[PDB]
Design an enzyme around this catalytic site. Sequence first.
Site, mmCIF file in Angstrom:
data_model
loop_
_atom_site.group_PDB
_atom_site.id
_atom_site.type_symbol
_atom_site.label_atom_id
_atom_site.label_comp_id
_atom_site.label_asym_id
_atom_site.label_seq_id
_atom_site.Cartn_x
_atom_site.Cartn_y
_atom_site.Cartn_z
ATOM 1 N N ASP A 105 -46.395 3.937 -12.106
ATOM 2 C CA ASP A 105 -45.817 2.776 -11.433
ATOM 3 C C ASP A 105 -44.356 2.589 -11.835
ATOM 4 O OD1 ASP A 105 -45.670 0.635 -9.730
ATOM 5 O OD2 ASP A 105 -46.615 -0.794 -11.108
ATOM 6 N N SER A 110 -42.338 -8.139 -13.044
ATOM 7 C CA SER A 110 -42.507 -6.707 -13.231
ATOM 8 C C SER A 110 -41.140 -6.042 -13.232
ATOM 9 C CB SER A 110 -43.393 -6.098 -12.141
ATOM 10 O OG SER A 110 -42.758 -6.070 -10.873
ATOM 11 N N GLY A 159 -43.298 -11.826 -10.230
ATOM 12 C CA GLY A 159 -41.902 -11.522 -10.002
ATOM 13 C C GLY A 159 -41.161 -11.000 -11.211
ATOM 14 N N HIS A 214 -44.358 -0.241 -7.489
ATOM 15 C CA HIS A 214 -44.990 -1.162 -6.553
ATOM 16 C C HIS A 214 -44.023 -2.224 -6.042
ATOM 17 C CE1 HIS A 214 -45.647 -3.863 -10.120
ATOM 18 N NE2 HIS A 214 -45.529 -4.802 -9.198
HETATM 19 C C1 LIG Z 1 -55.714 -4.282 -15.495
HETATM 20 C C2 LIG Z 1 -54.709 -4.078 -16.397
HETATM 21 C C3 LIG Z 1 -53.727 -3.011 -15.684
HETATM 22 C C4 LIG Z 1 -54.066 -3.136 -14.099
HETATM 23 C C5 LIG Z 1 -54.896 -4.212 -14.007
HETATM 24 O O1 LIG Z 1 -54.159 -5.381 -13.906
HETATM 25 C C6 LIG Z 1 -53.676 -5.707 -12.621
HETATM 26 O O2 LIG Z 1 -53.634 -4.907 -11.738
HETATM 27 N N1 LIG Z 1 -53.222 -7.083 -12.437
HETATM 28 C C7 LIG Z 1 -52.469 -7.455 -11.264
HETATM 29 C C8 LIG Z 1 -52.473 -8.982 -11.170
HETATM 30 C C9 LIG Z 1 -51.746 -9.438 -9.875
HETATM 31 C C10 LIG Z 1 -51.592 -10.992 -9.908
HETATM 32 C C11 LIG Z 1 -50.113 -11.360 -10.277
HETATM 33 C C12 LIG Z 1 -49.832 -10.929 -11.737
HETATM 34 C C13 LIG Z 1 -48.465 -11.501 -12.188
HETATM 35 C C14 LIG Z 1 -47.406 -10.725 -12.486
HETATM 36 C C15 LIG Z 1 -47.472 -9.178 -12.386
HETATM 37 C C16 LIG Z 1 -46.323 -8.783 -13.320
HETATM 38 C C17 LIG Z 1 -46.561 -8.001 -12.031
HETATM 39 C C18 LIG Z 1 -45.536 -8.508 -10.988
HETATM 40 O O3 LIG Z 1 -44.853 -9.457 -11.218
HETATM 41 N N2 LIG Z 1 -45.357 -7.827 -9.719
HETATM 42 S S1 LIG Z 1 -44.168 -8.537 -8.712
HETATM 43 O O4 LIG Z 1 -42.843 -8.559 -9.337
HETATM 44 O O5 LIG Z 1 -44.468 -9.947 -8.451
HETATM 45 C C19 LIG Z 1 -44.178 -7.622 -7.131
HETATM 46 C C20 LIG Z 1 -45.479 -7.553 -6.311
HETATM 47 C C21 LIG Z 1 -43.255 -6.407 -7.072
HETATM 48 C C22 LIG Z 1 -42.873 -7.702 -6.346
HETATM 49 N N3 LIG Z 1 -47.442 -6.878 -11.631
HETATM 50 C C23 LIG Z 1 -48.352 -6.845 -10.476
HETATM 51 O O6 LIG Z 1 -48.446 -7.745 -9.698
HETATM 52 C C24 LIG Z 1 -49.252 -5.572 -10.375
HETATM 53 C C25 LIG Z 1 -49.141 -4.634 -9.012
HETATM 54 C C26 LIG Z 1 -50.309 -4.173 -8.918
HETATM 55 O O7 LIG Z 1 -50.658 -3.269 -10.073
HETATM 56 C C27 LIG Z 1 -50.261 -1.931 -9.861
HETATM 57 N N4 LIG Z 1 -49.777 -1.526 -8.556
HETATM 58 C C28 LIG Z 1 -49.366 -0.121 -8.366
HETATM 59 C C29 LIG Z 1 -48.856 0.296 -6.965
HETATM 60 C C30 LIG Z 1 -48.412 1.746 -6.724
HETATM 61 O O8 LIG Z 1 -47.944 2.150 -5.463
HETATM 62 C C31 LIG Z 1 -47.833 1.179 -4.439
HETATM 63 C C32 LIG Z 1 -48.484 2.771 -7.872
HETATM 64 C C33 LIG Z 1 -48.996 2.352 -9.260
HETATM 65 C C34 LIG Z 1 -49.439 0.878 -9.500
HETATM 66 N N5 LIG Z 1 -49.933 0.460 -10.832
HETATM 67 C C35 LIG Z 1 -50.340 -0.925 -11.028
HETATM 68 C C36 LIG Z 1 -50.859 -1.398 -12.392
HETATM 69 C C37 LIG Z 1 -51.199 -5.451 -9.164
HETATM 70 N N6 LIG Z 1 -50.466 -6.044 -10.396
HETATM 71 C C38 LIG Z 1 -51.018 -6.980 -11.406
HETATM 72 O O9 LIG Z 1 -50.331 -7.366 -12.300
#
Ligand SMILES: CCCCCOC(=O)N[C@H]1CCCCC/C=C\[C@@H]2C[C@@]2(C(=O)NS(=O)(=O)C2(C)CC2)NC(=O)[C@@H]2C[C@@H](Oc3nc4cc(OC)ccc4nc3C)CN2C1=O
EC number: 3.4.22.-
Length: 197
Positions: free
Chosen positions: A99, A157, A155, A75
């Site tokens: 992911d 992940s 930020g 993602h």
């Molecule tokens: C419930 C428990 C598990 C799931 C439930 O929990 C959540 O979904 N909570 C959400 C909360 C979002 C609020 C902010 C949380 C703070 C930090 C989080 C550490 C981190 C990140 O920092 N990102 S990032 O660096 O800032 C950045 C945007 C890259 C720059 N992560 C995400 O934001 C992920 C992305 C998306 O989740 C997925 N998107 C996917 C996309 C795909 O194809 C496009 C394929 C597979 C995917 N599988 C998945 C699981 C939603 N996220 C969450 O954390």
Amino acid sequence: MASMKKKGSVVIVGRINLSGDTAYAQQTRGEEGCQETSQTGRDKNQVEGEVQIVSTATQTFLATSINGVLWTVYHGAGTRTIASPKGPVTQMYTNVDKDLVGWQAPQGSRSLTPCTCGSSDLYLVTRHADVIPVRRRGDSRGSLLSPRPISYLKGSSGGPLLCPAGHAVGIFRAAVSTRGVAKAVDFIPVESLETTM
Ligand SMILES: CCCCCOC(=O)N[C@H]1CCCCC/C=C\[C@@H]2C[C@@]2(C(=O)NS(=O)(=O)C2(C)CC2)NC(=O)[C@@H]2C[C@@H](Oc3nc4cc(OC)ccc4nc3C)CN2C1=O
Ligand SMILES: [Zn+2]
């Protein structure tokens, strides 16, 4: 067709320094050089360490070297190449269902060793070099000992969860949030990486 754009490469813009007694973030490339390196895919900067800070034109996150592969989240990276001294490098692993993506680890990087300890006392490393104690609660879940607003994890992940001995246990994927407070994290277990390999 003749005006269709190409997406740029992921670019290493810094690292989380874990070599000494104090963890701290370092920037190795500014936004301007990043944008230009993304377009060309040619990054001549020396890479060091296990945890890289990476950026696209629109996102910044982390990437972690384990077993000679630089791993990060789909993602953040999508199907993008990563910039290298010789030009863009194509992904070696891509799994949208996990992911997860991976490229060959850059020259000069150091790789974490996959954890075989079976321990549940973990540590999450964020893009701000915070080392957050995490208790493992399942195959892909761990709870923060001290919950944080999700702003502090955004930020990060692609960053590592580590065991007490500094082995790689998983890759940070998503935050489990209730009313903006991160009480737990979801992560890609290192065994799922080893299977993908
Ligand atoms: C419930 C428990 C598990 C799931 C439930 O929990 C959540 O979904 N909570 C959400 C909360 C979002 C609020 C902010 C949380 C703070 C930090 C989080 C550490 C981190 C990140 O920092 N990102 S990032 O660096 O800032 C950045 C945007 C890259 C720059 N992560 C995400 O934001 C992920 C992305 C998306 O989740 C997925 N998107 C996917 C996309 C795909 O194809 C496009 C394929 C597979 C995917 N599988 C998945 C699981 C939603 N996220 C969450 O954390
Ligand atoms: Zn271990």
